[PDB]
């Protein structure tokens, strides 16, 4: 069915490296240069107050919609990924349901500026105070601290590409039917990723990378804060939340 479901040679590993870096470039949502070309367009104190003055439900809707758009590009990355489409539909959904948010959280460090501790949100850079109306301060400081940690690693687009393929292709996801098939694909991508770090003299970041429990904690915290908002505003979720968001985080 697919080459990456068996043992691959050094040459095949080299083509996987370029395949992943290619698939990523076609689905990154915003170019790194465009994101760096805005670091100076910061939201004003008046605009920050404007966000802070927005209702909790409005802030949640805006954020859920932005999360949904970013997740949609991650779905495209997955489809263009070598071996993902050769997996069954159950496994494709399992991997995307568990991995999509984790990929968005990793991709996010590009859109975060460690110098001023701001994130590119709705056209400009704003600090974590911009999201004060959401009513989940622990989650926002946890997402900023994580992006601050990944920012310290000085990732290249290629490194983000290779690592995000790994975050998604996880053979340990509960509910996987073809566990051995996902095990071989994960192995080949681990080889692909480690090959590039070796070739680029970047193997030192391997020990500096966050644990798999960190990405899980952030995803679980998101589902927790969503359950709390849903209890407060059930109609806002039902009527104004994107169906993809509800499918991934509310199971319908």
């Amino acid at each position: 069915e697919n080459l990456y479901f068996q043992g691959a040679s050094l040459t095949e590993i080299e083509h996987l490296v370029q395949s992943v870096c290619k698939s990523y470039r076609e689905t990154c949502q915003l170019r790194l240069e465009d994101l760096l070309r805005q670091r100076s367009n910061i939201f004003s104190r008046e605009e920050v107050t404007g966000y802070q003055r927005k209702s909790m439900w409005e802030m949640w809707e805006r954020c859920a919609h932005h999360l949904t758009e970013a997740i949609q590009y991650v779905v495209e990355f997955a489809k263009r990924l070598s071996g993902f489409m050769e997996l069954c539909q159950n496994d494709q959904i399992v991997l995307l349901k568990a991995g999509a948010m984790e990929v968005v959280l990793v991709r996010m460090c590009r859109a975060y500026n460690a110098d001023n501790r701001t994130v590119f949100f709705e056209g400009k850079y704003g600090g974590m105070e911009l999201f004060r109306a959401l009513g989940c301060s622990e989650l926002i400081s946890s997402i900023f601290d994580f992006s601050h940690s990944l920012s310290a690693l000085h990732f290249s687009e290629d490194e983000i590409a290779l690592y995000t393929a790994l975050v998604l292709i996880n053979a340990h996801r509960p509910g996987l039917q073809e566990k051995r098939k996902v095990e071989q694909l994960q192995y080949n991508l681990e080889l692909a990723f480690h090959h590039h770090l070796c070739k680029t003299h970047r193997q030192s970041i391997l020990a500096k990378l966050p644990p798999k429990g960190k990405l899980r904690s952030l995803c679980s915290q998101h589902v927790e804060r969503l359950q709390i908002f849903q209890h407060l505003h059930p109609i806002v979720v039902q009527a104004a939340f994107p169906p993809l968001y509800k499918e991934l985080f509310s199971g319908g």
Binding site: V75, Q89, Q92, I93, K97, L244, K246, E247
Partner: peptide
């Protein structure tokens, strides 16, 4: 209940 993932995966 929603199922948009099945559509996104099929749509090519």
């Amino acid at each position: 209940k929603h199922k948009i993932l099945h559509r996104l995966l099929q749509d090519s």
